[PDB]
Amino acid sequence: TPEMPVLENRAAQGDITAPGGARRLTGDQTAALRDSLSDKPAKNIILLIGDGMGDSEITAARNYAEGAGGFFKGIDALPLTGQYTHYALNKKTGKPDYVTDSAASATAWSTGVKTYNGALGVDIHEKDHPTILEMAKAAGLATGNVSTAELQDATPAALVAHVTSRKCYGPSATSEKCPGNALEKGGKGSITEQLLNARADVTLGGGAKTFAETATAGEWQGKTLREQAQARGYQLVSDAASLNSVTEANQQKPLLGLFADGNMPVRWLGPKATYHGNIDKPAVTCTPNPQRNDSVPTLAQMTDKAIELLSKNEKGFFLQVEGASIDKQDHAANPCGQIGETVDLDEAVQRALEFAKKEGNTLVIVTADHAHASQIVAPDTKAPGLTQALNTKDGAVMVMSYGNSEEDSQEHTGSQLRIAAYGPHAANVVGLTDQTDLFYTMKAALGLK
Amino acid sequence: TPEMPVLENRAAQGDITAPGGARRLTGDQTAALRDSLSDKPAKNIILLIGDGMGDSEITAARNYAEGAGGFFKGIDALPLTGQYTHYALNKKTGKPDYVTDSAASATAWSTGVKTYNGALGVDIHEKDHPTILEMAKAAGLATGNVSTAELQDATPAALVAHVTSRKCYGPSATSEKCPGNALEKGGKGSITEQLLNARADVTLGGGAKTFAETATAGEWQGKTLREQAQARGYQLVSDAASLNSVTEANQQKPLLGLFADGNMPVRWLGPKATYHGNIDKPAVTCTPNPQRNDSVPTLAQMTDKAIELLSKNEKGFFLQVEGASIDKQDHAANPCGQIGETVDLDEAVQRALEFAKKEGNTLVIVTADHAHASQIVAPDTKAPGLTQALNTKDGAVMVMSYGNSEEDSQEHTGSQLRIAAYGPHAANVVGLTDQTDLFYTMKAALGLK
Ligand SMILES: [Mg+2]
Ligand SMILES: [Mg+2]
């Protein structure tokens, strides 16, 4: 018997050149929004993060993949929407730092405490705070952590690791850069070792590389981290076939999927933007990445599999899904990569909403940790940074610009950005909120203490 | 019947360095939102437009003027929020043009038809369509049109003029650039002449210059447009004292306030951003413009006066208020200018919300026509365009970047941006919508046609 509505179609409803033809609405929305509002408990939460997916990125991806008056059946379909702030803190002064990195922002929603750029799961005093995943597990809920990034990267790592620098992937980086955290120094360990201790029911991503490192101390000293996971009873999987053979995931047999050495394959290929690229180079049509095939699960497939396995828990589950970006160095300023990454997340969102609509007790939240610096500019633009012309689904040219930095490691900005939600307690993302409110929203929705 | 709530305080609630200290919420919002929803008639609408005020521009201005965890008591206080799209059309092909100007966007919300960049109140076939203001007047509602721009500029002009180019300020430019529209060539006339025909009850802004031109045909041939307004029964005012003297405004004595030759004075002064300006030049503290004083009404003052005069109409009123930017040219890339303009709008929004909350039947909408290209970047950023360090209310440095254009005429981007609303029918701004939906929202809320 009918659940809360997901937005079915907010594409332009007609001929965009005619009066009323670009409308996305067909009538009054007051009843629809009423029907979207419930304060019943959330049994499950699915949190989907698009790396750099601020409003500009969503718009550009829509323009390219769906056309300007098109509609992302995942990303655009959430009925309750707001804007949230994600400033970090200066470690020394405690004053706002207007432009966060991925680590401080993931720390904020996962713990409810602001922190300094580069911190995971700790505050500006380097004190550990519990994460929403740890708390969900302690309350008897199943837990999932899914990303197309290496699993040691900030977004997934923040759910399961407490370290003073996001660089602390394995034992060697930790001994050097976070000596207070190093296992041999009485610390909780590297990000990978702490992930293994956290023992979520389902962990799926890239990052096999670090598992080749050996532990410096503890029960599994001298064993590779892969050997340690094996010894501690994880089901290790490495491709789509081995993932699909998994029939259950729980504390006795926790699932750890390592699908790439570093990050998983980008969906779409295209050239790096160049100086006056929209003027001096032909318009670009993105191409499918050959590395992307049925042997490597997609974000949407990993999401579906996680939902399948976690939904067996009768108490409920918490799942985080990250559509990560490979957006630095040779890979910075790549519209095709960045748009394809958003399309990937859209598919995963559709899987999440399809489940949530049927199940009826699931809160789905879709946002970004911080926004990419890409801008949509006029077709004839002469811009001082990097630009590219693209052939969109509309059969028109869109130009994207990257003008925030002359170096190719600063890819994000301080702008507040869209947060959207569906299901019980979704009212809590509407209007202006802070990224730290997201922690408290999730905590309260699941009834965690 | 209590009042539908306005958000009283969504500043960070505590010590931003402590767990929960950066939360903007104190508890669950489901009840507040259920209390925010009504589809009863709107007696009045107040639409506030911030020129270029996308999410980035709101964040930058909040950061500077209120601190990162601060709160705009007007702009941030509307409980129902979404994101809307404002692409224009290529005139020849009818395909989307991903980056609109102020004319095509204003046409979109004022008529509900998409159009080409530079068009006012006409579609891609140069056919006139009625505006929300014209419709409100035809239904017996009082009408107001307030802007800190020249009143001939695109945003206020779109409510009252139908011309093939926004350049068509007066007879001279119209005869040259829009000959089909020129009065002596058989058209409805220049923007200014059509403004005089439209006869809103209250029109307040800049743009006295064009009123010195003389008409080329018609009953008032050879008279200046100022003399024409006098002959047609307008009350003309030119400063704060004359505006204060006004006791009523209606169809017998419509009010026309012309408070500057061109645009009204900018609130705050500061230097233009420069190449590597955050590195090479001191952090900037904005200063008050001497030209802003009690003899020139502020945006908030013009808003309050318009509300007082328009609210006498028992049937209801439609009022548009624009916080205009200047922006081009010598004036492009000016953080202090653009932030001060946003602070100006926030004050006007507070006046609109204070009225709306007490009146109970007033829909207040706050958005932008399109977003400025400014970006908030890391303090040590080396950017290829124009940059500036600013000393914020937090006692920390924020860097703004302008990296979209090597010229000083393109100042806006294609990103979807925040739309927020309060009062009856405010549900219709939540989720993804189009700028043309806003026309239909206003039309339906007021029961027009
Ligand atoms: Mg990430
Ligand atoms: Mg304007």
Strand ranges for A71-220 from DSSP E:
80-85, 88-89, 96-97, 142-150, 202-206
Cα separation, A76 vs B167, in Å, equals: 37
Smallest CA–CA distance, residue A331 to chain B, in Å, is: 18
* Burial label, B293 (beta-carbon count in 10 A; 0-12, 13-18, 19+): exposed
* Phi then psi dihedrals of residue B363, to 5 deg: -95, 125
Question: Residue A164: what are its φ and ψ, rounded to 5°?
Answer: -85, -10
Among A92, A75, A96, A157, which Cα is nearest to A435's? A96
| SS3 of chain B | CCCCCCCCCCCCCCCCCCCCCCCCCCCCCHHHHHCCCCCCCCCEEEEEEECECCHHHHHHHHHHHHCCCCCCCCHHHCCEEEEEECCEECCCCCCEECCCCHHHHHHHHHHCCCCECCCECECCCCCECCCHHHHHHHCCCEEEEEEEEECCCHHHHCCCCCECCCCCCCHHHHHHHCHHHCHHHCCCCCHHHHHHHHCCCEEEEECCHHHHCEECCCCCECCEHHHHHHHCCCEEECCHHHHHHCCCCCCCCCEEEECCCCCCCCCEECCCCECCHHHHCCCECCEECCCCCCCCCCHHHHHHHHHHHHCCCCCCEEEEEEECCCCCCCCCCCHHHHHHHHHHHHHHHHHHHHHHHHHCCEEEEEECCCEECCEEECCCCCCCCEEEEEECCCCCEEEEEECCCCCCCCCEECCCEEEEEECCCHHHHCEEEEHHHHHHHHHHHCCCC
Residues A341, A289: Cα–Cα separation, whole Å: 12
Residue A125 CB neighbours (<10 A): 10
Q: How far apart are CA A443 and CA A423, in angstroms?
A: 15
Q: Kindly tell me the burial class for residue B96, based on how many C-beta atoms sit within 10 Å of its own C-beta (0-12, 13-18, 19 or more).
A: buried
Report residue A207 as tokens.
């990052």
- In this structure, how many other beta carbons lie within 10 angstroms of the beta carbon of residue B312? 12
Q: Is B431 left (phi over 0), alpha (psi -120 to 50) or beta?
A: left
A41 backbone dihedrals φ, ψ, rounded to 5°: -65, 145
Tokens 């430019």 sit at which residue?
Answer: B173
From chain B, the residues in CB contact with A131 under 8 A are none
Cα distance between residue A191 and residue A171, in whole Å: 9
Pairing mode, if any, of strands B88-89 and B96-97?
antiparallel
Rounded to the nearest 10°, the torsion over CA A130, A132, A138, A143 is -130
Resolution of the solved structure (Å): 1.9
Long-range contacts at A9-15 (CB < 8 A, ≥ 24 apart): A9/A71, A10/A71, A10/A76, A10/A77, A10/B431, A10/B432, A10/B433, A11/A66, A11/A69, A11/A70, A11/A71, A12/A68, A12/A69, A12/A70, A12/B434
Residues 6+ apart with CB under 8 A from B445: B41, B42, B45, B363, B424, B425, B428
Q: Of A344, A364, A251, A240, nearest to A289 (Cα)? A: A344
Helices (H), A390-446: 435-445
Contact of A13 with chain B, judged by CB distance below 8 Å, is answered with no
Q: Are B33 and B79 in contact (CB under 8 A)?
A: yes
Mutate to test the interface with B, among A90, A406, A416, A439 (most CBs of B within 10 A): A416
Which of B16, B417, B428 lies nearest to residue A89, judging by beta carbons? B16
Q: Are A75 and A58 in contact (CB under 8 A)?
A: yes
Contact A396 B90 (CB under 8 A): yes
Region of A94 (left: φ > 0; alpha: ψ -120 to 50; beta: rest) is left
Burial of A219 (0-12, 13-18, 19+ CB in 10 A): exposed
A122, β-bridge pairs:
A128
* Shortest-distance ligand to the CA of residue B104: 2
Helix A299-310 with A335-359: angle, nearest 10 deg: 20
A414 CB neighbours in chain B (<8 A) are: 56, 59-60, 63, 375-377, 398
Q: Would you tell me which residues 250-279 of chain A have a C-beta closer than 8 angstroms to some C-beta of chain B? A: none
CA distance A262 to B291: 59
* Alpha-carbon gap, residue A168 to A185, rounded angstroms: 14
Residue whose structure tokens are 């011309």:
B163
Place of tokens 């802003």: B292
Structure tokens of A97?
Answer: 């730092």
Chain B residue with CA closest to A424: the answer is B30
Q: What are phi and psi of B18, to 5 degrees?
A: -105, 155
Dist. CA A259–CA A240, nearest whole Å = 8
Question: Is the link from the previous residue into B13 a cis peptide, with omega within 30 of 0?
Answer: no
Does A153 count as an annotated binding residue? yes
Cβ neighbors of B250 (< 8 A, separation 6 or more) are B142, B201, B312, B313
* A419: DSSP letter: E
Residue A288 and residue A268 in contact, taking contact as beta carbons nearer than 8 Å: yes
Distance of alpha carbon B318 from alpha carbon B309, whole angstroms: 12
Chain A positions in Cβ-Cβ contact with residue B71 (cut-off 8 Å): 432
User: Residue B308 burial (CB < 10 Å; 0-12/13-18/19+)?
Assistant: middle
Residues linked to residue A215 through DSSP beta bridges, in sequence order? A221
Look up residue A433 and give its DSSP letter: E
Q: Which amino acid is at B302?
A: M
- The rounded distance, in Å, linking the Cα atoms of B5 and B423 is 9
Q: Tell me the CA–centroid distance for residue B204 and ligand 2, in Å.
A: 14
Token pair listed for A204: 């799926």
Please give the full DSSP string across A220-265, using - where no structure is assigned.
TBTSBHHHHHHHTT-EEE-SHHHHHT----SSSS-EEEE-SSSSPP
- Please name the amino acid found at residue A216: T
How many angstroms separate the CA atoms of B388 and B403, rounded? 12
Q: Considering only residues 132 to 151 of chain B, which have any Cβ-Cβ distance to chain A shorter than 8 Å?
A: none
Cα-based distances in Å from B63 to A308, B21, B69, B392, B406: 43, 17, 8, 6, 26
- Residue B381 contacts residue A356 (beta carbons within 8 Å): no
Reported in sequence order, the residue ranges of A3-87 that DSSP labels E, i.e. its strands, are: 44-50, 80-85
Q: Which ligand is nearest to the CA of B102?
A: 2
Angle B171-B175-B176 from CA coordinates, rounded to 5°: 120
Rg (chain B; Cα; Å): 21
Q: Which residues contact A128 (CB under 8 A, 6 or more apart)?
A: A121, A122, A162, A188
Q: What is the DSSP string of A332-351?
A: SS-HHHHHHHHHHHHHHHHH
B322 close to B365: Cβ distance less than 8 angstroms: no
Count of beta carbons in the 10 Å neighbourhood of residue B145 = 27
CA-closest candidate to residue A339, choices A50, A36, A38, A48 = A50
CA-based nearest residue to B195, from B179, B171, B219, B177:
B171
Active centre residues of A (catalytic) = 102
Helices (runs of H) and strands (runs of E) counted in chain A: 13, 19
The single-letter code of the amino acid at B18 is A
Beta bridge partners of B413: B371
Chosen from A401, A430, A439 to mutate, greatest number of chain B CBs within 10 A: A430
Closest CA to B96 of A286, A249, A8, A66: A66
Residues 219-248 of B with CB under 8 A from A: none
Q: What are the helix (H) ranges across A311-434?
A: 335-359
Q: Does A76 touch chain B (CB under 8 A)?
A: yes
Report CA(A363)–ligand 1 centroid distance (Å): 22
Q: Where are the domains of chain A?
A: 1-449
Question: B447 CB near a chain A CB, below 8 Å?
Answer: no
Q: Do A28 and B67 touch (CB under 8 A)?
A: no
Question: How far is A59 from B54, CA to CA, in rounded Å?
Answer: 13
- Experimental approach: X-ray
CB contact residues (below 8 A), chain B span 103-122, against chain A: 108, 111-114
Q: Are B88 and B117 in contact (CB under 8 A)?
A: yes
What is the enclosing helix (H) or strand (E) of A389?
A: strand A386-391
The pair of structure tokens assigned to A73 is 């059946």
Q: What is the DSSP string of A283-305?
A: PB--EE-TT-STTS--HHHHHHH
Q: Measured between beta carbons, which residues in chain A are less than 8 angstroms from residue B420?
A: 431
CA A148 to CA A322: how far, in whole Å?
Answer: 7
DSSP A423: S
| C-alpha span between B62 and B20 (Å, rounded) | 20
SS3 state of residue A268? strand
> Which of B405, B322, B425, B331 has the alpha carbon at shortest distance from B368?
B322
Output Rg (C-alpha) for chain A, integer angstroms: 21
State yes or no: A28 annotated in a binding site. no
B373 touches chain A (CB under 8 A): yes
Q: Is A405 on the interface with B (CB under 8 A)?
A: yes
User: Rounded to 5 degrees, what are φ and ψ at A18?
Assistant: -100, 155
CA distance A279 to chain B (A): 13
Q: How far is B52 from chain A (nearest CA, A)?
A: 14
Q: Chain A: give the shortest CA distance to residue B45, in Å.
A: 16
Return the residue of B nearest to A124 by Cα: B17
CA distance B428 to B421: 9
Residue type, A310: L
**Which residues in chain A are closer than 8 Å to B63, comparing Cβ atoms?**
87, 96, 98, 414
Q: What one-character DSSP code corresponds to residue A165?
A: -
Residues in chain B: 449
For chain A, breaks with the C atom over 2.5 A from the next N come after: none
B219: Cβ–Cβ under 8 A, 6 or more apart, which residues? none
Chain pair A-B, CB pairs under 8 angstroms: 346
Per the annotation, binding residues of B for Mg(2+) are 51, 153, 155, 322
* β-pairing verdict for B397-402 and B386-391: antiparallel
Residue A434 φ/ψ, nearest 5 degrees: -110, 155
Report which residue type is found at B202.
V
Residue A153 is classified by DSSP as S
In one letter, which amino acid is A321? V
- Reply yes or no on whether B325 is catalytic: no
Specify whether the CB–CB gap between A149 and A205 falls below 8 A.
yes
Specify whether the CB–CB gap between B419 and B84 falls below 8 A: yes
**Number of other CB atoms surrounding residue B343 within 10 Å:** 21
3-state SS class at A323: strand
For residue A299, CA distances in Å to A145, A204, A234, A290 come to 12, 9, 21, 16
Helix (H) / strand (E) element for A61: namely helix A55-66
Q: Tell me the sheet residues that pair with B163.
A: B120
Name the class of domain B1-449: alpha beta
Judged by DSSP in three states, A3 sits in coil
User: What's the rounded Cα separation, in Å, for the pair B382 and B288?
Assistant: 29
Burial class (CB in 10 A: 0-12, 13-18, 19+), B294: exposed
